[PDB]
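This part of the workshop introduces the protein records we will be handling. Getting from the letters to the tokens is the skill we practise here. The record below serves as our worked example for the rest of this section.

…
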Amino acid sequence: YLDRKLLTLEDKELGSGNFGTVKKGYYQMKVVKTVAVKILPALKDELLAEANVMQQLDNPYIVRMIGICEAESWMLVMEMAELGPLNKYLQQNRHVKDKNIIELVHQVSMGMKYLEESNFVHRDLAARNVLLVTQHYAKISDFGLSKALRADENYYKAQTHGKWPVKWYAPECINYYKFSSKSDVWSFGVLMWEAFSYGQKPYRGMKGSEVTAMLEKGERMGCPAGCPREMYDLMNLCWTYDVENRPGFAAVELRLRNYYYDVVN
């Protein structure tokens, strides 16, 4: 738990949604640290579960949680990623080099490799949820739909089909409500497309049911302009319909590791 007196909140609103709003601030530590504060019974239980997941995670490519504070509203204090979301940054900076995209995409795969090792499912892996510390440093955020996998289960089964980002979801998520690390691999493939399309929305002008109908026909999104063939090959590899033949984050990270080092050297 954190002290409200040490936490200094600013009027500058970073984000806004159904939960409430995300505002910029700075918490007084043992040197002051710039923070992004998520400001809010259903929403309160969600924020507490989101905090418990973030507390269990320790990786340089995962957004770090400072702690929780209860005052004017329930607050989730997390580290500030100055450059903001990946999709919005690329939308405002179309001149970003292809090598720089591979670098940031590989950083997400390293962070996702950790989540696979820690046996955690993200369930909301999109370009909007990838935050930039700098132009060459990316971190994974929004653990609101994230779940800690059971010791005996390799997947998370959801009872109800609530507010879900359909366009980033694997076929087993839509059809059987099953969420594994390989389901996040499919989401990573969509994330890759968004990154190489410079923050463009996937399956534009299409409805959730139309996306499902497209994927059943074996149809996948086209290669973005300027995106290398090897990176688009990995996208389709992530977009394998059957969960069994779809690669894990260890294989996806390695393919990205070897290709990024091939571009630089």
Observations:
- The chain is about 35% helix and 20% strand.
- Helices lie at 42-56, 86-92, 98-117, 171-175, 181-196, 208-216, 229-238, 249-264.
